[PDB]
DNA sequence: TAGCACGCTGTGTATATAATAGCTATGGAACGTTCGCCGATGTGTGTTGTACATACATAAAAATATCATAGCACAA
């Protein structure tokens, strides 16, 4: 990819003594850039990752290059260990395993052999936006190499600590514009859209009488959000496109999941059921609407479903939802003549959550994506299958929300 | 006059020779029937001691957000 050689030209310029951060999309090949840099340096390279799936991907890249089984390419994890050799090495480690404090499973010595014997020379950190934390400062404080590299896709955080990475690892060298990359490769056009649904009177006065995170249980459970949600679901099913529903709250995800009758993936869920739901979403055309929480978004991103719906949200964590949204957008690439990606933000008027979703839309403006407002698409008035459209169901839902407030 | 005893009559017995008719024991082959003592040495289990792989509540980490309290500032 041209931008990858545009990033490698900086390494080809000076050669020795260099450190910086390279911003590349998730769908791009930053791991290939790490492989090329590993071929240019030829030394013990350590790749800092947070999940085993990324370790398996880096191992697959090592297989795409050459060798992995002979005593040279090592693997560090809490399950097994593998030997290494000087002058050339490729190993992937976990942040929580290298960090620690005093808990030990007779494996911290195996890491202190890679760090004690001084077999290093190249540092690779996956997702640098997570570095602003004490454990990563300890990791950097326990390592020292000749060349450092930071592979990440985003860096927008409101912790005011992203600027420290300019001296902890190095200043950002190349930031690729996702619009020009969309022109190089169709990574699904980004259509940002907020749905403005009216707010009922009872949920408005009860919403004002509530506060903190409890008023979210009155912002999400609005009947017009169920009507507009069903209208968007039936609309996308009529267009023949799969639907992914995001929710920062597990309770709302279970409510919409059970009321819509679709599979759901949330916390404390068996992994076999998660894999079954994933296979049903990949193969079965009857399941075109999945309800995914943060566990289903951080662990895996699927290239299907051009329809992304956002209902639940948390205060301040708008940039993280923009990063996950960006992961689902960049995950969809196949060079199509159309390829229209639709992001809907179900927001209710006069609520305290839309005013942060606007900050998320500001993050979506900083990336160059297109944003437009949507009050209501004509067609919901012709859907007799809408729930909570009658005053009876609205009063019953009001009583259910009041009971939910009495439980919390 | 009938059993008993005596004399008389018929039969089997052994033998060569042939005629030349049916009658039959024999060995083989095939189908249907009830039935199937103390000492020394060596094995033989079963609950269970030992043991391994996956589940699951814990520990912890890590990542973060929001009310309360002290101090400083402002008002009835």
Curated annotation (Swiss-Prot):
Functional summary from the UniProt entry: ATP-dependent DNA translocase. Component of the general transcription and DNA repair factor IIH (TFIIH) core complex. When complexed to CDK-activating kinase (CAK), involved in RNA transcription by RNA polymerase II. May have 3'-5' helicase activity alone, the TFIIH core however has no 3'-5' helicase activity. Also involved in transcription-coupled nucleotide excision repair (NER) of damaged DNA. In NER, TFIIH acts by opening DNA around the lesion to allow the excision of the damaged oligonucleotide and its replacement by a new DNA fragment.
Name of the gene: SSL2
Domain called Helicase C-terminal: residue spans: 227-381
Organism lineage: Eukaryota, Fungi, Dikarya, Ascomycota, Saccharomycotina
GO BP field: nucleotide-excision repair; poly(A)+ mRNA export from nucleus; regulation of mitotic recombination; RNA polymerase II promoter clearance; transcription by RNA polymerase II; transcription initiation at RNA polymerase II promoter; transcription open complex formation at RNA polymerase II promoter; transcriptional start site selection at RNA polymerase II promoter
Range covered out of full length: 363 to 770 of 843
Additional detail: Present with 825 molecules/cell in log phase SD medium.
Keyword set, alphabetical order: ATP-binding, DNA damage, DNA repair, DNA-binding, Helicase, Hydrolase, Isomerase, Nucleotide-binding, Nucleus, Phosphoprotein, Transcription, Transcription regulation
UniProt-annotated location(s): Nucleus
Name recorded for this polypeptide: General transcription and DNA repair factor IIH helicase/translocase subunit XPB/SSL2
Disruption phenotype: Essential, it cannot be deleted; epistasis studies suggest it is involved in damaged DNA excision repair.
Domain Helicase ATP-binding: 11-173
Parts forming coiled coils: none
């Amino acid at each position: 990819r041209p931008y990858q050689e545009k990033s490698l030209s900086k390494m080809f310029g000076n050669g020795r003594a260099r450190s910086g951060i390279i911003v590349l999309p998730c769908g791009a090949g930053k791991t290939l850039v790490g492989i090329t840099a590993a071929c240019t340096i030829k030394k013990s390279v350590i790749v800092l990752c947070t999940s085993s799936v990324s370790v398996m991907q880096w191992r697959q890249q090592f297989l795409x290059x050459x060798x992995x089984x002979x005593x040279x390419x090592x693997x560090x994890x809490x399950x097994x260990x593998x030997x290494x050799x000087x002058x050339x090495x490729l190993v992937v480690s976990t942040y929580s395993m290298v960090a620690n404090x005093x808990x030990x499973x007779x494996x911290x010595x195996x890491x202190x052999x890679x760090x004690x014997x001084x077999x290093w020379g190249f540092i690779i950190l996956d997702e640098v936006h997570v570095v602003p934390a004490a454990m990563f400062r300890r990791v950097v404080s326990t390592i020292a190499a000749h060349a450092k590299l930071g592979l990440t896709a985003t860096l927008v955080r409101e912790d005011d600590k992203i600027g420290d990475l300019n001296f902890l690892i190095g200043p950002k060298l190349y930031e690729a514009n996702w619009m020009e990359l969309s022109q190089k490769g169709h990574i699904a056009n980004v259509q940002c859209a907020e749905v403005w649904c009216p707010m009922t009177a009872e949920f408005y006065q009860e919403y004002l009488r509530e506060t903190a995170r409890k008023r979210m249980l009155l912002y999400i459970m609005n009947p017009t959000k169920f009507q507009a949600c069903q209208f968007l679901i039936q609309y996308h099913e009529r267009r023949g496109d799969k639907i992914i529903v995001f929710s920062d709250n597990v309770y709302a995800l279970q409510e919409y999941a059970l009321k819509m009758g679709k599979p759901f993936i949330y916390g404390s869920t068996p992994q076999q059921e998660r894999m079954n739901i994933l296979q049903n979403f990949q193969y079965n055309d009857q399941i075109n609407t999945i309800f995914l929480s943060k566990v289903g978004d951080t662990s895996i991103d699927l290239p299907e479903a051009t329809c992304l719906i956002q209902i639940s949200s948390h205060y301040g964590s708008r940039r993280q939802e923009a990063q996950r949204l960006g992961r689902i957008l960049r995950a969809k690439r196949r060079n199509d003549e159309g390829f229209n990606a639709f992001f809907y933000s179900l927001v209710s008027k006069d609520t305290q959550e839309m005013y942060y979703s606007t900050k998320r839309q500001a993050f979506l403006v900083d990336q160059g994506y297109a944003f437009k407002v949507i009050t209501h698409l004509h067609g919901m008035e012709n859907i007799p299958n809408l729930a909570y459209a009658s005053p009876r169901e609205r009063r019953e839902l009001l009583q259910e929300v009041l009971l939910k407030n009495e439980e919390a």
